[PDB]
Amino acid sequence: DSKPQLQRLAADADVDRMCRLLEEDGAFILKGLLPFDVVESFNRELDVQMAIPPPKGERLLADKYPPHFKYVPNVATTCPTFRNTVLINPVIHAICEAYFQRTGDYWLSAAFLREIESGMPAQPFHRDDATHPLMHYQPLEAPPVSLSVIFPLTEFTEENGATEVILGSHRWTEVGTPERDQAVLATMDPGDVLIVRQRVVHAGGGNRTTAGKPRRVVLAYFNSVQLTPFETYRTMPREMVESMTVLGQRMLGWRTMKPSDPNIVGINLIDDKRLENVLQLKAADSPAL
Amino acid sequence: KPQLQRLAADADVDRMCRLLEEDGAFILKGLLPFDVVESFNRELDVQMAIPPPKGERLLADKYPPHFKYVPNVATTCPTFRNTVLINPVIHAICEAYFQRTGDYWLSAAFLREIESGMPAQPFHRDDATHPLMHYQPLEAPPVSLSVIFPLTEFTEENGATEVILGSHRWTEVGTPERDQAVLATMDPGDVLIVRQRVVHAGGGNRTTAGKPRRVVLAYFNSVQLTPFETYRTMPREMVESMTVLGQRMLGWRTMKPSDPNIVGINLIDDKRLENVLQLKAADSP
Ligand SMILES: O=C(O)CCC(=O)C(=O)O
Ligand SMILES: O=C(O)CCC(=O)C(=O)O
Ligand SMILES: [Co+2]
Ligand SMILES: [Fe+2]
Ligand SMILES: [Fe+2]
């Protein structure tokens, strides 16, 4: 395409370059971060969840939509491949650690599945600043407090509606009403990852195919520990929590974390002690640390 | 010189609200009955009577040993948990104050005791705990409210809280003189309420009589902000003996930031946290 496209990088790519891509272009792609077997076992875990008949009670998001609406909340609690493998991907966290360098500690606000079936229209262009509305008022220069991480679980094509990203649009004052051709396509294979900076204007593609195969995507939101996690993993059984690594525990809110100075004490604590100490939390990788 | 306006506990909320935008702070006179003040004080006395613990202390270890401090009083002081935390007047103020941001809860509630011979605090804005606040524009929906409970009297001598009126409209804290501020002189049972961005400081105790100034600070934040103190390790029995309002304040229920957040926050399995937990409450139908 005539317009400059989304840079696609190998898993082992340089971190300074990814970080500078995020500030200049606002987005980039990692190629084959997740092995195909990982991707497929994740998909089967999700298949199980979606196969579950609709429950009797209230569902806060689902009840707002038609019954054909496909959605799996907080995948870490029901998809071990995500909890144990995807969530603690070292490349992802290296990016996060560079990205959140000014704001301090980050954790996982949400990780959920979205399936877009044939005949569904594109999303309107938007900035991912609705969940925590205060973000709408954050100046561009301020230390970023949220990172969008997008996992294609089916192929992302021009036809089925690969994610549309407008490069450099995070420097815009408002989203406005940009035309579709201002954006480029995040065409990907399962195992690739799209990483999108805060304030970058984007939109879901919408599935124009007619063969029945639906587009499947898991969206993960990594936020500053200043921001309340949309999904709370506090009801995870202790056995499951302790089977995770320390990084895993920190991501899911089971540990005291640290916003950058001038916060010098930290956050998410109790009795002036670390939450994991009060809980006496064990971890799969705590003898080695 | 313009002073801190003192309002009756039953005063109109619309006036309190207009004060918070105009002066940036105000005082409620005698909000807490004497029995409340005294039982709260006795509960805190119990807590401070516990010997210095052996392990790490995240805040206490950052300051001198003479620094007196009791964290997350709601878990150890029933008077605060059952009476003070859910004060209807406080929440009338909050619901007006946080209308643009949506739901609010309790980030921290702790005791500080300032002994004789201690210097004044430097002037500051209470935006260090959540640094992102430092970049929030003046016009943006406020996301934090400082609520200050004097448990001993606040006098000129013992170091009543120094508040600079209208300073929330300043671009920077700068280096203001002490004589730019007015004094939050109060009796136990009064409440000092301070807007976000209002420059202020602890007074510093000029007395030599030994009575240390005692204050409980409660920070009510938008549910967008992660609570500094997490009350997730409270026993279920303690949680379920509380009112719904109390549970919402201590992070045990799903909450709702203002639109365009339309689902809410602090939820799980696409359900309300309290439903998944099947949480009972003292005043729930
Ligand atoms: O469907 C997509 O690829 C993007 C979805 C998205 O950006 C959102 O839901 O905020
Ligand atoms: O001690 C006081 O009266 C006020 C303290 C204060 O503003 C603070 O510690 O942030
Ligand atoms: Co002067
Ligand atoms: Fe989005
Ligand atoms: Fe303060």
Is residue B215 within 6 Å of ligand 2 at its C-beta?
A: yes
> Whole-angstrom Cα distance, residue B176 to residue B125?
12
A62-69 — which CB contacts under 8 Å span 24+ positions? A62/B270, A64/B262, A64/B263, A68/A117
Give the count of domains, chain A: 1
Q: Do B56 and A274 touch (CB under 8 A)?
A: yes
Spatial distance between the Cα atoms of B102 and B142, rounded to a whole number of angstroms: 10
In terms of residue numbers, what domain contains B203?
Answer: 1-285
Which residue has its alpha carbon closest to ligand 2 atom 1? B202
Cis amide bond preceding B260, omega within 30: yes
Q: Token digits for A111?
A: 């990780």
Q: Is B236 helix (H, G, I), strand (E, B) or coil?
A: helix
The experimental technique behind this entry is X-ray
* B58 CB-contact burial (10 Å; exposed 0-12 / middle 13-18 / buried 19+): buried
Looking from the CA of residue B192, the nearest atom of ligand 2 is 3
Q: 3-class DSSP state for residue B217?
A: strand
Closest approach of chain A CAs to the CA of B64, in angstroms? Answer: 15
Contact of B282 with B241, CB cutoff 8 Å: yes
Q: DSSP string spanning A29-80?
A: EEET-S-HHHHHHHHHHHHHHHHSPPPSS--TTGGGS-TT--EE--GGGT-H
For tokens 């001038």, what's the residue? A262
A130 C-alpha to ligand 4 centroid (Å): 9
Tokens of A176: 């406005």
Of A228, A265, A279, the CB nearest to B225: A228
Residue with CA nearest ligand 1 atom 2: A204
CA torsion sign, A17 to A21 to A27 to A31? Answer: negative
Over its C-alpha atoms, chain A yields an Rg (Å, rounded) of 19
CA atoms within 13 Å, Cβ hemisphere of A104: 20
Give the CA distances from residue A195 to residues A21, A25, A30, A168, A200, in Å, rounded to whole numbers and listed in that order.
Answer: 10, 11, 8, 14, 11
Residue in A with minimal Cα distance to B60 = A272
Q: Are the Cβ atoms of A269 and B140 closer than 8 angstroms?
A: no
Nearest Cα to Cα of residue B38 among B154, B207, B160, B187: B187
Q: In DSSP terms, which residues pair with A79 in a beta bridge? A: none
Helix H or strand E encompassing B238: helix B236-240
Calculate how far, in angstroms, residue B149's C-alpha sits from the geometric centre of ligand 2.
11
- Residues of chain B found within 8 Å of residue A142, distances taken between Cβ atoms: 132, 135
DSSP character string of B134-165: GGS-TTSPP-EEEEEEESS-B-TTTTPPEE-T
| Contact assignment for A270 to B229 by CB distance below 8 Å | yes
Q: Shortest CA distance to B105 belongs to which of A228, A255, A61, A276? A: A228
Residues, chain A, total? 289
Q: Is the CB of A250 under 6 A from ligand 1?
A: no
Which domain CATH number covers A234?
Answer: 2.60.120.620
- Cα B208 to Cα B211: distance, rounded to the nearest angstrom: 8
Number of helices (H) and strands (E) in chain A: give both, helices first: 7, 12
How many beta-carbon contacts under 8 Å exist across A and B? 167
Reported resolution in A? 2.5
Contact yes or no for A192/A36 (Cβ under 8 A): no
